[PDB]
Design a protein around this ligand. Sequence first.
Ligand SMILES: OC[C@H]1O[C@H](OC[C@H]2CCCNC2)[C@@H](n2cc(-c3ccccc3)nn2)[C@@H](O)[C@@H]1O
Ligand SMILES: [Ca+2]
Ligand SMILES: [Ca+2]
Ligand SMILES: [Ca+2]
Length: 132
Amino acid sequence: CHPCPWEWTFFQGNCYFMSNSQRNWHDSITACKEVGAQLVVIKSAEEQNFLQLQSSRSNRFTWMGLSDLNQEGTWQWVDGSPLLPSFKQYWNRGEPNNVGEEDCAEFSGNGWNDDKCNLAKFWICKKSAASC
Ligand SMILES: OC[C@H]1O[C@H](OC[C@H]2CCCNC2)[C@@H](n2cc(-c3ccccc3)nn2)[C@@H](O)[C@@H]1O
Ligand SMILES: [Ca+2]
Ligand SMILES: [Ca+2]
Ligand SMILES: [Ca+2]
């Protein structure tokens, strides 16, 4: 028994996978569903730091499961949960700025950016670990 599939990273009871290819935001959602996972929904500050460190180290602009597609300026996770005020700190300086209509969130440098959902980026999937 092992908690996560091969090539997935265990962190605090969940399993994470960073892609090696690039897709747009909606196709990244589909990619995670196909492996029994979800485009990453962040639930804690420690989880944010863990994910941001990997995006920063790898120098990969990476989608997360967050959008303001339903209501411009109101950010919602793909599981329906709202972006809480304790997470506004992670936006990069000047973000979100919706320049040229940007409705999907990415890890970019040290924080988050809103970018065009049609752009191809890396993505991270998350699913719960098995108990061994
Ligand atoms: O336009 C894509 C992103 O360009 C920059 O971010 C860098 C990219 C690098 C590739 C991965 N995504 C992040 C940031 N930017 C653009 C502008 C801006 C403002 C007014 C007029 C013209 C441009 N201000 N800031 C982000 O806000 C943008 O979303
Ligand atoms: Ca919009
Ligand atoms: Ca927007
Ligand atoms: Ca932006």
